[PDB]
Amino acid sequence: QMSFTFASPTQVFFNSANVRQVDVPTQTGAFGILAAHVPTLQVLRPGLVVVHAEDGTTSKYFVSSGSVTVNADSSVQLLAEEAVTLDMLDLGAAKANLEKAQSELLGAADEATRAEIQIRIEANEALVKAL
Amino acid sequence: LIIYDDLSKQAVAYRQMSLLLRRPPGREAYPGDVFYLHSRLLERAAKMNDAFGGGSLTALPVIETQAGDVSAYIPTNVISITDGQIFLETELFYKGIRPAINVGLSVSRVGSAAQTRAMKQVAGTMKLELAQYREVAAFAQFGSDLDAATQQLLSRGVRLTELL
Amino acid sequence: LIIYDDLSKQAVAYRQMSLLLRRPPGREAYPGDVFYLHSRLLERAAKMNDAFGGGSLTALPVIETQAGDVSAYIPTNVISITDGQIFLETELFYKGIRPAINVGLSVSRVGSAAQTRAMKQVAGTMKLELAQYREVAAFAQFGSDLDAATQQLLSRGVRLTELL
Amino acid sequence: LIMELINNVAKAHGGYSVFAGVGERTREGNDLYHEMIESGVINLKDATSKVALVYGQMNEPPGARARVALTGLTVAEYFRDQEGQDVLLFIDNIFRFTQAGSEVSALLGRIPSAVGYQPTLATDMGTMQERITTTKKGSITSVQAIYVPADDLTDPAPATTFAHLDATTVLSRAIAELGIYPAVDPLDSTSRIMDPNIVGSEHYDVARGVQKILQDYKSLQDIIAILGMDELSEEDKLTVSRARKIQRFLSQPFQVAEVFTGHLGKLVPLKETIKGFQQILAGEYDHLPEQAFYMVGPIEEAVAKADKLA
Amino acid sequence: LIMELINNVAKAHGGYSVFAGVGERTREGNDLYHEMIESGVINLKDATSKVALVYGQMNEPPGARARVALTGLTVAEYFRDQEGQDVLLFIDNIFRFTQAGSEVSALLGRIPSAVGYQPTLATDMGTMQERITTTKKGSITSVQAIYVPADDLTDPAPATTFAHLDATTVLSRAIAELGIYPAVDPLDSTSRIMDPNIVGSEHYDVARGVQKILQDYKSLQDIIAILGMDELSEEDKLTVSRARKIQRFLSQPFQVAEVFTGHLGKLVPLKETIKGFQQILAGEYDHLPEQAFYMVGPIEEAVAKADKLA
Amino acid sequence: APATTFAHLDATTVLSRAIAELGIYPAVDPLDSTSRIMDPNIVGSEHYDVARGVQKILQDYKSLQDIIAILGMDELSEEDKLTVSRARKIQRFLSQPFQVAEVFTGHLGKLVPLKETIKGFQQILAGEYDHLPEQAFYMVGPIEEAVAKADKLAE
Amino acid sequence: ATLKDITRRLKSIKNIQKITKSMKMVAAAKYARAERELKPARVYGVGSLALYEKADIKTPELIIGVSSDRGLCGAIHSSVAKQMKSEAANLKEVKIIGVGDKIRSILHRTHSDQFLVTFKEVGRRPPTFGDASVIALELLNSGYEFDEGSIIFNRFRSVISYKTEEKPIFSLDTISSAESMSIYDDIDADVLRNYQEYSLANIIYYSLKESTTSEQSARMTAMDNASKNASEMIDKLTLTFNRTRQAVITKELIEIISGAAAL
């Protein structure tokens, strides 16, 4: 057993809920955390969140950016700035943004502007990894 | 159309005589028949039927109040005597609203049936809208987080007030 | 036992007499002896000693205040005649509390040492806990959001109130 | 409201009415005259009339204004003792009767009492208001229109009048603008006989229930406008929707006003009203819409109206 | 209060005492007489009797109430001049003298003054009051309770009485209804003795400090009346908290108050009173709750009272 | 007695103890003084509109006075409390050191021409002097002096 | 007491009774929205600190005030300013950050030179993580590498009750690595530089979401008191007016009759 807590600033999903394993899109690829997983802190990356429920059927979500935490005792918490379910995201407008984002990349030389446009590329390029 | 300007000053002129003829004094030194002085004067205004020629006399008494006190003996008399009143206030005056007619208090009993069918068509609407305006009037500036409904009822009122 | 219902209406009656007689109208147009009118009457309620026969006349006169005004001329007089008062606030009556006795204002001066001991055994710690509840419990709405030792005084009060 | 009261007493109890206009404005006298003929109570042809009109106009001296309330009372007194009716007496307005009597006492030369009123005020009121009661032969029930000066209830005029008042009927602009007719304020009008001992055990709890349910509605009004309608609890959502259906069932079309409205007038018997409101409180009509109870007679005409088309 | 004062000063007095009941309740004499016999100040068996009694209560006609004050003070006059001692004169109620005058002035053929009083109010009181005094032959300590009609301190009767006085102790209803007893207004009461050259500059500086802290609290009372205490500055928040503690430390359980307020009566020595209010002013007790100062004798009992609340 | 006298006049100038209490001399009440010649067809439409505007802002401030006295100053918006600081400067520029009151005021008496007065209040209403404190306007002659007094009141 | 004076105060209290009445309503809507938006934001704050409480963090050897702009909320700005000035003297270098104008004015004159940044418009629009991020950005862009800080705010409890609370922020990246952190493995030096930055934005947002809920509730309260302290003062002066009206009429009449009954 492990208590799982997953939420955003606007909406709450899990609160000390009994769950066996969770997959998280961290910076270091995608880490999988089981019931008695090691104490490892890793920050988030735009991608897919897999939450293995207690009854065979799994719910999956999409994240923009945030943080996950696994502790010295069996308890996990995951938070994101804006996390939305696969249900409410359009596959149309995601390509419109990506192509506009890959246009400003070659039209900006400033070292500060380059990072800001590439992050938007990364986020929009992750919007097709699920839809 | 007749305008008694003013009845408060006739009331003074009558009072003198009674006090000096040594008739009993009452409230504010006025004799018993000072209500009766104005009641018989203002009922004399009427609208005759086509049986009596169909002519009409229309009365407009003026009453001066002190410190806005409409509950002074003479004003109390004339208010009941008449079919209606128009209340003018010092505040409304200098605030800008001229003629300084207090929409709230001012009232006419004949009202609706006296104005043309053209005026009727836009008056009662204005009566209702200024009514809903005056209830919220105090929060005309202190209402950033008010609903768009009362925010319309405030914008509707201020603009009608300018029109009058 | 005599009950005078009421002296305020007997007052206006006597004020009518005094003013018709042309005696100097004073406070609230009342004559100089409206205190005396009620002084000589309520003195006549008395408890005789055994030598005189041990008979007693007990008086309950009634007074009708206007909008809670106890400081008024006639009421203050009767406060200064009688050996105690019972106040009936409109704010408790038009609330459902009947009899509408203001406990924080009504006192019976020479009536304590005429109470049953069995009553003193229960009313003594009732008067004590009722003032402990009236120790500003107007805050009212919070349910279980206050302290610990003061929340039971709110509990006791309303029950000791409903019982009355 | 006056005319309907005249109609309904003549209808239900077979008792005549008397209007005594104290300080009647002559324009308003003429206007009230034709309004009574045009509606049915005064019959210029036959003998089916239900009212006696007495006019103490304003342009008449204080003597005439001070005594006309008696001239009306005496015409009403005949129908109490000689024909044994439950009579109805209208005085409009009672304050101008008090001011009439103040003028007289001021004229005779009597030293004025408090607030400028007459010394005989208590009796000047008593010797008239005590003729209006229920006798062995009949009864006169009087509706009196009151003017309060400076809106001061402690003013001796309304203060002396209130000692004789058993019930009040507040006609309000606010209720009239909502569309409820007659324009009676349900919480503002109070009665001495609102007692389980007088009207009955049932009448009392049903009236108080209606009184409480409308206060609760007012008590939730700020919570309605500024919180979110759909966040009231089940018991708070229900009492709101039930309360709206109560104030609509207060509405009643008037017989007198068939010439204007065009819609049929209603006389709702006593027990019809009591049970009608009791059922809405008990929720027996939680399914029916709001517009169903508006301007209807008994509860039956409300459910029938609820059908309409869909 | 005047009964407590007797119990305090009159009983522990060497010289003689005169009581004059003027126009108050008759049972208020039957109370005083039987209570005094009990305490020994009136002795029936022998003649070691210390107090002289004269009565003209509110059962007596105006004339008797008009002259009964004179009767009493004349009995007191003798013990001052013809024997030259320390007389204590007590009068309740001194107002009934001018009230009785008011009652006859009309009939005497005067024209009424202000509030319909006797035009002779000014001097009627003067000639009578100026007798009640300390002379070079003897001394009279005169305690006279003064009825205020309609709580109107501007009524010609109580307002003329001030001029005749050395110490005025004003009882206020507002204070009384706040459950403060004795209900003495601590800002309206004045003594001609309040002069550092008499009471001592240490007494004077504590009286002027308590009055300043109370005047400041009263002047903030219109802002707190709407806003509530939360909105005051951190400097003022303290002055409020002390003034309130002072307010209640000005309240006191009287020995005559025992037989209905359940609390043991208290007399406080002057050094304990001055040192008491000094410490509250000095901020030594800013930690004790307000109610710990409520209805207690010396300041050492506030400390005891605070400990009880565990 | 004075109430009957009103109907006998062409122009009335009313004085308050409450205005004099605040040291504002002359203690003429801006909302209580009425002239027969306060017609733009006589005095000019510029003269009229300025004066009407002068009164309105003082009138508006009088309505705010009791609201702000209990409920602070911060609750007024940037266009509300801007009128408050203006009205108090218009209130104080109405004060005038008289040539007769030399013994009381402690200042040399001033006489201001008609057009110097209208220009005065016009600018303050326009808000052209919003930077200057109120005390600059208290007891001066023409408007240039209100600037002069600010400069001296600086350092 | 005069008829001129009495009605002037009746004219102005009937203003306050109403002005305050709507300011209760304005705050009542803002409370109900802030109470719902706090429900998740609490869980968010719970999950945010669930690491610094499960593994002890000290410091071997920054004050943040969270309130708003708009006052009249009773004692919201004044309770946090008391606990800020409490630590302004009790401590070591102290640098202050105040969110909400009513911290730049209440506890300024005293620590005028101890200011790092000021924030306005707080409490006008319900706060967002976007607002907290601007608070996070400005903190890390300033050349103040703080050893340790604490955030002080008003935690919501109920409609009438709230408590000033401190929360220590161990946001020094040099302090992020302690002996209690030796329990944890698989970490970068510059992955804490990412986590610490974000866990800062969370707690700022949490304190901000608690504050604007605790603020609007007690303003709803203070104004429901003040409007019904004026409701009482209206009903008290109105019948004081009637006293004085009736007495002025009676007194003006005795004054005549007295003069008539002398001739």
UniProtKB/Swiss-Prot annotation, chain A:
Transmembrane segments: none annotated. Disulfide bonds: none annotated. GO terms for molecular function: proton transmembrane transporter activity; proton-transporting ATP synthase activity, rotational mechanism; structural molecule activity. It is found in: Mitochondrion; Mitochondrion inner membrane. The modification N6-succinyllysine is found at residues 100, 129. It comes from the Eukaryota. GO terms for cellular component: mitochondrial envelope; mitochondrial inner membrane; mitochondrion; proton-transporting ATP synthase complex. Keywords: Acetylation, ATP synthesis, CF(1), Hydrogen ion transport, Ion transport, Membrane, Mitochondrion, Mitochondrion inner membrane, Transit peptide, Transport. One of its GO terms (biological process) is mitochondrial proton-transporting ATP synthase complex assembly. The modification N6-acetyllysine is found at residues 100, 129. Component of the ATP synthase complex composed at least of ATP5F1A/subunit alpha, ATP5F1B/subunit beta, ATP5MC1/subunit c (homooctomer), MT-ATP6/subunit a, MT-ATP8/subunit 8, ATP5ME/subunit e, ATP5MF/subunit f, ATP5MG/subunit g, ATP5MK/subunit k, ATP5MJ/subunit j, ATP5F1C/subunit gamma, ATP5F1D/subunit delta, ATP5F1E/subunit epsilon, ATP5PF/subunit F6, ATP5PB/subunit b, ATP5PD/subunit d, ATP5PO/subunit OSCP. Belongs to the ATPase epsilon chain family. This is ATP synthase F(1) complex subunit delta, mitochondrial. It comes from Bos taurus. The chain holds residues 37 to 167 of 168 of the full protein.
Swiss-Prot record, chains B, C:
One of its GO terms (molecular function) is ATP binding. The record marks 106 as: Required for activity. Its main location: mitochondrion. GO terms for biological process: proton motive force-driven ATP synthesis. Mg(2+) binds at residue 5. The keyword Membrane applies. The modification N6-acetyllysine is found at residues 120, 127. It is found in: Mitochondrion inner membrane; Cell membrane. One of its GO terms (cellular component) is mitochondrion. Keywords: Acetylation, ATP synthesis, ATP-binding, Cell membrane, CF(1), Glycoprotein, Hydrogen ion transport, Ion transport, Magnesium, Membrane, Metal-binding, Methylation, Mitochondrion, Mitochondrion inner membrane, Nucleotide-binding, Phosphoprotein, Pyrrolidone carboxylic acid, Transit peptide, Transport. Acetylated on lysine residues. BLOC1S1 is required for acetylation. Subunit alpha, of the mitochondrial membrane ATP synthase complex (F(1)F(0) ATP synthase or Complex V) that produces ATP from ADP in the presence of a proton gradient across the membrane which is generated by electron transport complexes of the respiratory chain. ATP synthase complex consist of a soluble F(1) head domain - the catalytic core - and a membrane F(1) domain - the membrane proton channel. These two domains are linked by a central stalk rotating inside the F(1) region and a stationary peripheral stalk. This is ATP synthase F(1) complex subunit alpha, mitochondrial. The gene is ATP5F1A. The chain holds residues 308 to 471 of 553 of the full protein.
UniProtKB/Swiss-Prot annotation, chain F:
The modification N6-succinyllysine is found at residue 152. It comes from Bos taurus. Homotrimer. Component of the ATP synthase complex composed at least of ATP5F1A/subunit alpha, ATP5F1B/subunit beta, ATP5MC1/subunit c (homooctomer), MT-ATP6/subunit a, MT-ATP8/subunit 8, ATP5ME/subunit e, ATP5MF/subunit f, ATP5MG/subunit g, ATP5MK/subunit k, ATP5MJ/subunit j, ATP5F1C/subunit gamma, ATP5F1D/subunit delta, ATP5F1E/subunit epsilon, ATP5PF/subunit F6, ATP5PB/subunit b, ATP5PD/subunit d, ATP5PO/subunit OSCP. Catalytic subunit beta, of the mitochondrial membrane ATP synthase complex (F(1)F(0) ATP synthase or Complex V) that produces ATP from ADP in the presence of a proton gradient across the membrane which is generated by electron transport complexes of the respiratory chain. ATP synthase complex consist of a soluble F(1) head domain - the catalytic core - and a membrane F(1) domain - the membrane proton channel. These two domains are linked by a central stalk rotating inside the F(1) region and a stationary peripheral stalk. The modification Phosphoserine is found at residues 45, 63. This is ATP synthase F(1) complex catalytic subunit beta, mitochondrial. Signal peptide: none annotated. It is found in: Mitochondrion inner membrane. The modification N6-acetyllysine is found at residues 56, 110, 115, 152. It comes from the Eukaryota. Belongs to the ATPase alpha/beta chains family. The gene is ATP5F1B.
From Swiss-Prot, chain G:
InterPro entries: ATP_synth_F1_ATPase_gsu, ATP_synth_F1_gsu, ATP_synth_F1_gsu_CS. It is found in: Mitochondrion inner membrane. Keywords: Acetylation, ATP synthesis, CF(1), Hydrogen ion transport, Ion transport, Membrane, Mitochondrion, Mitochondrion inner membrane, Phosphoprotein, Transit peptide, Transport. The modification N6-succinyllysine is found at residues 24, 85, 120, 236. The modification N6-acetyllysine is found at residues 14, 30, 85, 120, 163. It is a peripheral membrane protein. GO terms for molecular function: proton-transporting ATP synthase activity, rotational mechanism. Signal peptide: none annotated. GO terms for biological process: proton motive force-driven ATP synthesis; proton motive force-driven mitochondrial ATP synthesis. GO terms for cellular component: mitochondrial inner membrane; mitochondrion; proton-transporting ATP synthase complex. Its main location: mitochondrion. The modification Phosphoserine is found at residue 112. Belongs to the ATPase gamma chain family. Subunit gamma, of the mitochondrial membrane ATP synthase complex (F(1)F(0) ATP synthase or Complex V) that produces ATP from ADP in the presence of a proton gradient across the membrane which is generated by electron transport complexes of the respiratory chain. ATP synthase complex consist of a soluble F(1) head domain - the catalytic core - and a membrane F(1) domain - the membrane proton channel. These two domains are linked by a central stalk rotating inside the F(1) region and a stationary peripheral stalk. This is ATP synthase F(1) complex subunit gamma, mitochondrial. It comes from Bos taurus.
